[PDB]
């Protein structure tokens, strides 16, 4: 991905902490070095082909140094409870055509003028209850939105029984009428899904949707058919794909600005992040000032990234070694 | 809460405003 | 003033008065009164403390600080434009321009309805005790001593307990030292004479330092070379 | 009310006590006495039936300007047992050292 | 009757009322009736005002010693008032006839409890102490605030609540917390 | 004790409610 | 042991006493022996005086939680003292032995509590209350009354009782109040 | 604390002792007495639950401005056994006139 | 419980702490518990503060009389503080009940010892003496330094550490 | 004022007395 | 490190805010 | 003796840890 | 503060004191 910078953004991966210069053996370690007169902080790392350093943070020229956890950088997948509107008709009437329209807004482009509209349709009959109707529409949407021919994963749809009321039964384009054996289906939850990600070229972005309904003419009136209420999210998209494209961008300052442009001839930078691991981020934003008439500021930042294991163990040790060496009060997350 | 005689007098003087006698129908 | 106003407590004057056997019944109670009388009769501005304090105007009226004695200036808090004396006789009275003000007691009558005004006012330097605090300039101390001596001898002479020659000598000495103190506290310093010189010699006269807080009364008037 | 009567009786008694010891009370204070007993007369007669609760609020807040204004009118004292910072006499009685799922637990 | 605890919660989100009836051998027949909340805007001297902030009836909650103890945690933001700049007045009523051996003066059915938020005063004291830490001089505003608080305390303890409202609204109304 | 108008409204209305 | 309610009724009739042993499980065997009421004029440094104002032995009653909590509601007219110009010392004597392992200093057999009528003091303070409003002047009377009360409070809670009587005699012994009307009043 | 109590009692007792001997105390010092006892009741009341350790630092460092300000308030004395330069009572005991590869040795 | 030597190393690289328990017969049950280091920034009157500079627990070193005596040598640069402009406060604790025959006031679990670097003071005294050598006049800064050092001594020995830090920060740092 | 129910009953009782 | 009854009272008043009874489940 | 907020936090957390 | 363990034991001892 391509992000905006405050005149630079440099990233260093904290795969291990070693506390001294002569202990840097594995690639990806970190030692926060500072002198006893608290005037300069800098970070020595073990790059995969040598020891590198950071830029020399003037500790009085710091603006903020705040460390952010792994759950504050995870995208929540929004849901939609699609139900029958009881004030129009509690049970589906036996003549009208019941159509649900899903309105996507960033289907291939980035704009909200690049839209997409997928549908689901049921013709309601006599003797068809509310539960037998939701059994007929989750199959109709899974044969539209979750088929094996669609070019992109758009949404994920589930049904909810009234006995369970929390666990999702997934419906895909192979599920039949006889697989779902429940007489108490009361909603159809449509959930956003994770779009594909190729490192640095196809970043983590999503396709949003809004379920919209057609009319059933219940009594000589074109009443809207349903109501779609947004539920609280349950599934998260983890932080591995964001930091892997964030390290892929920030290596371009200390290294090659191209990454593969021209392929007999690249300088192949070896990366340290795993895209299947969740990470914590500490971003120290400092600046530069000449001690003269030019007191004008040149803003910088150094982003450190450490692995999250659930209890924030690898980042809380990284914050404390910066706290005592440099004398800054970074809040332990 | 305790009511003494003058509070009762005020209450009757207020209620007398609303009411009439039979001859007044 | 050439010299500086180093502050000392009031009984420094009673150190000096009570050397005289005829002034031994003077007290701090009498010293306070006659010292305030001398401070006011002399009216020297270097003896007062320069303070600035902002107030709000409710409707052509505002509450005045407690320790105010005189107002150097009043200005609008947002514009900085200074206020003038109010010549108008019907300010806050309607029927059926340039802002101004007026102050009598604890109330300041401005010509603005709802605004905040900055007042640069003068007060008295106080002690840890709520008492006046006097300069230690020996000219000032000697003149105040002579003032208190002259008042006490006037009382004793009205009683007939002092020879008229004694009172005449005391009045003569006090008059000379009053003139001396007046000149001492008034004549400009070298740094003040630079301000006066910059004000005086102006090829293009500046006549609008009242709008500002007399900030540029003393700036030099630099003419470009052609 | 039954208290405006007491306040007024005390006020005029003090007024005439001063006129007994002295022969002068400030007429700026006699004006406050006059306001006080006029209100006492008006609220304790046939004119109280026009009083709303907003009128009562305004009347009380106007009368309390007279409270410490003079020696004759004095701040009334009512029966109160409250304060701006109340006491905490609750007792802690733990049960079988039992923490709840998150919080502690008592009887 | 009496108050067990009467404060605003330390999180500035709840107004805690805990009432109990006196344990006396002549107060068995006395129960609790209702809780009425008033602010400095609606307060009136003669009992709770009309159009009160929050009326609470105790027989709704319970389905007899339960009636003799009541506790509440009223979310202040549901009352639609500022937890910093409000002076809650809590009235309580008995609904009960004490015994005939009641000593003179104890048969008071109604009580009253005043409530204020102490955080703003605490932060003001910390600001003034920080000013004191420089040059070791006491700001006059600090002494003024202390004595004004003492004035409000005296007014409350003496039952002179209207002038307490006057002092509060004039002096302490603009509070950050 | 002191009654306002609203007190009289309460008393009279509640009495008519019980008649 | 501790005090639950130590107060004089605002009607200037009743010196209310309500003492209860502390509820911890070492204080079963400790009971209440007697309640001794003493005044500023008959005070002694250690323990109650040999000429108290009132004595009340708890054990001359039902003979166990009824002992562990006691309440007295003395009429002050019977004691023949002024409710307002009198400052009372309430001594409560314990009967028993606390069980061992208690932290030391909790096993205090005697507890003392001071009582005063604050209503006349608030009457005096209300006179200088309005000096708080006026600016440009120090509220000297308000500060003086606050310091007068706080001196007695401080000297009581520190145990410096003799100086507390000295201050009480200097300041508040000339307090005046409306004596309770012996014929009781109709109200409720 | 139990010491703000002692300081406040001492300060107000000295205040009233001066008002007994003389008839005047500087109100600039009555301000300090007011601040002192207001702080002590602040810290020994229901408002002691809102204080962090930083607030404790600030409160102590602000109260120490009142320490020697007037005769009523004094510098408190605590039980201390320290000093800026300490005494060295360690003893020297080598082993049969031995040394290490570089230096001396003891028991 | 007392201090044997509490000194900053002459090389300005180690902070020497050598604690011991008193030899009297009724501290036989008493041991040493922990060592907590605080500076002029993190001190609090009520014992050691939160987020201290360096905590030490003495069971960790050993594997009982060995626990009655302890010696530490902390590389000051590892503590990330300035050895020249830092005033260290060293707390110690006991975790042990003395006998029932203890004379009153002797049973105290905690102690405290203040530490500073005497090298800068020595250099200032040498500089002022050099000034005195020229014309044999006493600079007033020298007398001010002497009296301010004595003031900090009095504050430390009376336990008034807040004003002690105030003087230290105001005079011997800035 | 609130006029809890027994106050209304007192008012009824008094009024109904000379009824 | 000795605690008096008052310190325990402060501990009680702090802990009471965090705990509730059976009825409050 | 004196407590701050953090002291109470430590005490209550240590209580809950062992309950 | 820096509480020792034995102080915590004292606290729970005195809390379960009213058990």
The secondary structure of chain D as a DSSP string is --SHHHHHHHHHHHHHHHHHHSS---HHHHHHHHHHHHHHHHHTSTTGGG--HHHHHHHHHHHGGGTTTSSSS----------SS--------B-TT---SSS-BB-
Q: Which two tokens stand for residue G32?
A: 């209440």
Give me the residue label for tokens 């009960």: E96
Q: Determine the Cα–Cα distance for residues C112 and C99; give it in Å rounded to an integer.
A: 7
User: What is residue H18's three-state secondary structure?
Assistant: helix
Report the residue numbers after which chain M has a gap, meaning the C atom sits over 2.5 angstroms from the next written residue's N, or none: none
Sign of CA dihedral I55, I56, I59, I64: negative
With touching defined as 3 or more inter-chain CB pairs under 8 Å, the answer for chains L and G is: no
Q: How far is CA E168 from CA B14, E141, E151, E162, E163, in A?
A: 37, 16, 10, 10, 8
Q: Determine the Cα–Cα distance for residues A157 and A144; give it in Å rounded to an integer.
A: 11
Q: Determine the Cα–Cα distance for residues C66 and C121; give it in Å rounded to an integer.
A: 11
Helix (H), strand (E) at residue A191: strand A185-192
Chain K CB within 8 Å of residue H49 CB? yes
Length of chain I: 174
Q: What is the largest CA-CA distance in chain L?
A: 27
Question: How far does the CA of residue F4 sit from the closest CA of chain D (Å)?
Answer: 5
Q: How far is CA H67 from CA A146, A309, C63, I157, in A?
A: 78, 52, 37, 16
Contact A95, A123 (CB under 8 A): no
CB atoms within 10 A of CB C51: 14
Interacting residues of G71 by C-beta distance below 8 A, sequence separation 6+: G5, G16, G17, G18, G19
**Are the beta carbons of I47 and M4 separated by less than 8 Å?**
no
Strand partners, C56: C116
Question: How far does the CA of residue H2 sit from the closest CA of chain L (Å)?
Answer: 6
Interior angle at CA A147, CA A146 and CA A148, nearest 5:
125
With touching defined as 3 or more inter-chain CB pairs under 8 Å, the answer for chains E and M is: no
CB atoms within 10 A of CB E109: 19
Q: Determine the Cα–Cα distance for residues G107 and G98; give it in Å rounded to an integer.
A: 7
**Chain I residue numbers touching M4 (CB-CB < 8 A):** 33, 93, 95, 109
**Chain K residue numbers touching L12 (CB-CB < 8 A):** 14-15, 18
Contact E70, E105 (CB under 8 A): no
Angle between helices I119-133 and I140-158 (to 10 degrees): 150
Instruction: For residue E5, report the phi and psi dihedrals to the nearest 5 degrees.
Output: -140, 145
Contact A156, A138 (CB under 8 A): no
Q: Determine the Cα–Cα distance for residues I87 and H83; give it in Å rounded to an integer.
A: 12
Q: Which two tokens stand for residue A176?
A: 């039949």
Q: How far is CA A332 from CA A301, A323, H11, I2, I53, in A?
A: 19, 10, 44, 37, 16
Angle between helices J5-17 and B5-18 (to 10 degrees): 80
Q: What is the largest CA-CA distance in chain G?
A: 65
Q: Determine the Cα–Cα distance for residues C111 and E177; give it in Å rounded to an integer.
A: 38
**Chain H residue numbers touching D85 (CB-CB < 8 A):** 45-47
Sign of CA dihedral I71, I75, I79, I82: positive
Q: Determine the Cα–Cα distance for residues A131 and J3; give it in Å rounded to an integer.
A: 55
DSSP H helical ranges for chain G: 65-68, 76-79, 119-129, 140-157, 161-171
Q: Would you give the end-to-end CA distance of chain E in angstroms?
A: 32
Contact H66, E143 (CB under 8 A): no
Q: Determine the Cα–Cα distance for residues C19 and C7; give it in Å rounded to an integer.
A: 22
Instruction: For residue I157, report the phi and psi dihedrals to the nearest 5 degrees.
Output: -70, -20
**Are the beta carbons of I81 and A36 separated by less than 8 Å?**
yes
User: What is residue H79's three-state secondary structure?
Assistant: coil
User: What is residue A102's three-state secondary structure?
Assistant: strand
With touching defined as 3 or more inter-chain CB pairs under 8 Å, the answer for chains M and I is: yes
User: What is residue I90's three-state secondary structure?
Assistant: strand
Please tell me the experimental approach by which this structure was elucidated. cryo-EM
Q: Which two tokens stand for residue G188?
A: 């409720």
User: What is residue C99's three-state secondary structure?
Assistant: coil
DSSP symbol at C39? H
Q: Which of I3, I92, I18 is nearest to I55 (CA)?
A: I92
Q: Determine the Cα–Cα distance for residues B8 and B6; give it in Å rounded to an integer.
A: 5
Contact K7, L4 (CB under 8 A): no
Q: How many CA atoms lie within 13 A of A162 on its CB side?
A: 9
**Chain H residue numbers touching C128 (CB-CB < 8 A):** 26, 28
Q: Determine the Cα–Cα distance for residues D15 and D7; give it in Å rounded to an integer.
A: 12
DSSP string, C179-211: HHHHHHTTS--HHHHHHHHHHH--SS----TTT
Strand partners, A50: A47
**Chain G residue numbers touching B2 (CB-CB < 8 A):** 186-188
Q: Which of D62, D84, D89 is nearest to D73 (CA)?
A: D62
Angle between helices E140-157 and H27-43 (to 10 degrees): 60
Give me the residue label for tokens 């004008």: A296
Q: Which of A157, A174, A172 is nearest to A209 (CA)?
A: A157
Interface partners of chain D (CB pairs < 8 Å, 3 or more) are B, E, F, G, H, K, L, M
User: Can you say how many angstroms the Cα of residue A90 is from the centroid of all Cα atoms in its chain?
Assistant: 38
Question: How far does the CA of residue M18 sit from the closest CA of chain L (Å)?
Answer: 16
Q: How far is CA A129 from CA A68, A82, A166, G186, in A?
A: 49, 16, 21, 73
**Chain D residue numbers touching G130 (CB-CB < 8 A):** 67-69
Suggest the residue from G150, G155, G171 to mutate for an interface test with chain H (most H CBs closer than 10 A). Answer: G150
Window 11-30 of I, Cβ < 8 Å to H: 18
Q: Determine the Cα–Cα distance for residues C54 and C78; give it in Å rounded to an integer.
A: 11
Q: Which two tokens stand for residue G176?
A: 């005046």
Q: Which two tokens stand for residue I55?
A: 């905590």
**Are the beta carbons of H43 and L2 separated by less than 8 Å?**
yes
Q: Determine the Cα–Cα distance for residues A125 and E31; give it in Å rounded to an integer.
A: 62
Q: Report resolution (Å) to 1 decimal.
A: 4.4
Interior angle at CA I76, CA I73 and CA I81, nearest 5:
150
Helix (H), strand (E) at residue A16: strand A16-17
Instruction: For residue C32, report the phi and psi dihedrals to the nearest 5 degrees.
Output: -60, -50
Using left for φ > 0, alpha for ψ between -120 and 50, and beta otherwise, residue A317 falls in alpha
Instruction: For residue G167, report the phi and psi dihedrals to the nearest 5 degrees.
Output: -65, -40
Q: Determine the Cα–Cα distance for residues H32 and H15; give it in Å rounded to an integer.
A: 11
Q: Would you give the end-to-end CA distance of chain C in angstroms?
A: 39
CB atoms within 10 A of CB I133: 8
Q: What is the CA radius of gyration of chain E?
A: 19
User: What is residue A243's three-state secondary structure?
Assistant: helix
Q: Would you give the end-to-end CA distance of chain I in angstroms?
A: 36
Instruction: For residue I19, report the phi and psi dihedrals to the nearest 5 degrees.
Output: -100, 155
């Amino acid at each position: 991905m391509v992000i905006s910078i405050n005149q630079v953004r440099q990233l260093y991966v904290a795969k291990a902490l070693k506390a001294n210069t002569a202990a840097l053996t594995t690639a990806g370690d970190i030692v926060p070095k500072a002198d006893t007169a608290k005037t300069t902080l800098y970070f020595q790392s073990m790059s995969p082909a040598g020891i590198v350093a950071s830029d020399k943070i003037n500790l009085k020229h710091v603006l903020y140094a705040k460390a952010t956890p792994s759950e504050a950088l995870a995208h929540k997948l929004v849901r939609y409870s699609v139900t029958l509107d009881a004030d129009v008709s509690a049970t589906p009437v036996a003549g009208q055509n019941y159509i649900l329209r899903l309105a996507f807004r960033q289907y291939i482009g980035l704009s909200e003028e690049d839209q997409y509209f997928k549908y689901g349709e049921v013709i309601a009959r006599s003797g068809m209850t509310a539960s037998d109707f939701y059994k007929k529409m989750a199959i109709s949407l899974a044969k539209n939105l979750e088929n094996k021919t669609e070019s992109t994963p758009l949404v994920n749809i589930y049904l909810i029984s009234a006995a369970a009321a929390s666990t999702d039964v997934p419906v895909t384009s192979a599920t039949k009428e006889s697989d779902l054996t429940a007489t108490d289906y009361n909603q159809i939850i449509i959930e956003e899904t994770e779009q594909p990600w190729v490192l640095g070229m196809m970043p983590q972005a999503f396709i949003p949707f809004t379920p919209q309904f057609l009319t059933i003419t219940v009594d000589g009136e074109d009443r809207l058919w349903g109501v779609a209420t947004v539920v609280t999210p349950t599934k998260t998209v983890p932080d591995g794909h964001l930091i892997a494209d964030l390290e892929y961008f920030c290596m371009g300052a200390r290294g090659d600005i191209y990454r593969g442009m021209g392929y007999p001839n690249i300088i192949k930078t070896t990366y340290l992040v795993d895209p299947g691991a969740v990470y914590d981020v500490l971003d120290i934003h400092y600046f530069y000032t000449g001690s003269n008439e030019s007191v004008q500021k040149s803003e910088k930042t150094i982003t450190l990234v450490a692995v999250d294991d659930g209890s924030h163990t690898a980042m809380n040790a990284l914050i404390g070694a910066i706290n005592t060496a440099s004398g800054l009060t970074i809040a332990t997350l | 809460m305790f009511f003494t005689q003058e509070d009762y007098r005020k209450i009757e003087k207020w209620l007398l405003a609303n009411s009439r006698k039979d001859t007044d129908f | 003033m050439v010299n500086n106003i180093n502050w000392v407590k009031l009984p420094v004057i009673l150190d000096r008065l009570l050397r005289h056997p005829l002034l031994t019944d003077l007290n701090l109670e009498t010293a306070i009164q006659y010292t305030l009388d001398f401070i006011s009769a002399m009216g020297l501005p270097n003896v007062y403390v320069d303070k600035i304090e902002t107030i709000d105007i409710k409707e052509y009226r505002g509450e005045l600080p407690c320790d105010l004695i005189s107002i150097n200036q009043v200005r609008l808090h947002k514009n900085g434009i200074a206020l003038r004396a109010m010549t108008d006789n019907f300010n806050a009275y309607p029927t059926h321009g340039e802002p101004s003000f007026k102050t009598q007691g604890r109330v300041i009558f401005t010509s603005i309805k709802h605004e905040k005004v900055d007042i640069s006012y003068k007060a008295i330097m106080l002690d840890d005790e709520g008492l006046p605090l006097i300069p230690d300039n020996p000219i000032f101390l000697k003149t105040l001593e002579l003032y208190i001596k002259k008042e006490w001898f006037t009382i004793l002479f009205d009683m007939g307990k002092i020879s008229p020659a004694v009172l005449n000598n005391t009045q003569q000495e006090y008059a000379f030292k009053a003139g001396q103190c007046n000149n001492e506290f008034v004549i400009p310093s070298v740094s003040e004479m630079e301000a006066i010189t910059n004000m005086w010699n102006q090829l293009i006269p500046r006549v609008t330092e009242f709008r500002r807080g007399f900030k540029n009364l003393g700036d030099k008037e630099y003419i470009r070379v052609h | 009310m039954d208290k405006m009567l007491e306040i007024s009786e005390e006020a005029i008694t003090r007024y005439f006590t001063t006129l007994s010891q002295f022969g002068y009370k400030k007429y700026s204070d006699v004006d406050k006495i006059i306001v006080l007993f006029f209100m006492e007369e008006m609220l304790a007669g046939e004119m109280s039936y026009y009083v709303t609760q907003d009128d009562y609020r305004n009347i009380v807040n106007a009368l309390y300007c007279l409270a410490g204004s003079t020696c004759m009118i004095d701040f009334p004292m009512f029966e109160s047992y409250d304060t701006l910072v109340h006491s905490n006499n609750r007792t802690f009685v733990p049960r079988i050292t039992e923490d709840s799922i998150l919080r502690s637990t008592e009887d | 009757m009496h108050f067990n605890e009467l404060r605003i919660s330390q999180d500035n989100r709840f107004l805690i009322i805990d009432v109990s009836v006196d344990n006396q051998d002549y107060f068995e027949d006395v129960l609790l009736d209702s809780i009425v909340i008033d602010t400095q805007d609606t307060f009136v001297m003669n009992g709770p005002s009309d159009n009160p902030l929050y009326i609470y009836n105790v027989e709704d909650a319970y389905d007899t010693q339960q009636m003799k103890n009541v506790r509440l945690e009223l979310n202040i933001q549901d009352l639609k008032v500022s937890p910093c700049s409000t002076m809650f007045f809590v009235y309580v009523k008995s609904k009960g006839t004490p015994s005939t051996d009641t000593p003179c003066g104890f048969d008071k059915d109604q009580i009253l409890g005043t409530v204020i938020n102490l955080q703003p005063i605490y932060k003001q004291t910390l600001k003034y102490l920080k000013e004191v830490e420089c040059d070791c001089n006491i700001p006059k505003g600090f002494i003024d605030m202390i004595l004004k608080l003492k004035a409000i305390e005296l007014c409350v303890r003496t039952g002179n609540y209207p002038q307490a409202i006057k002092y509060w609204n004039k002096f302490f109304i603009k509070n950050n917390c």
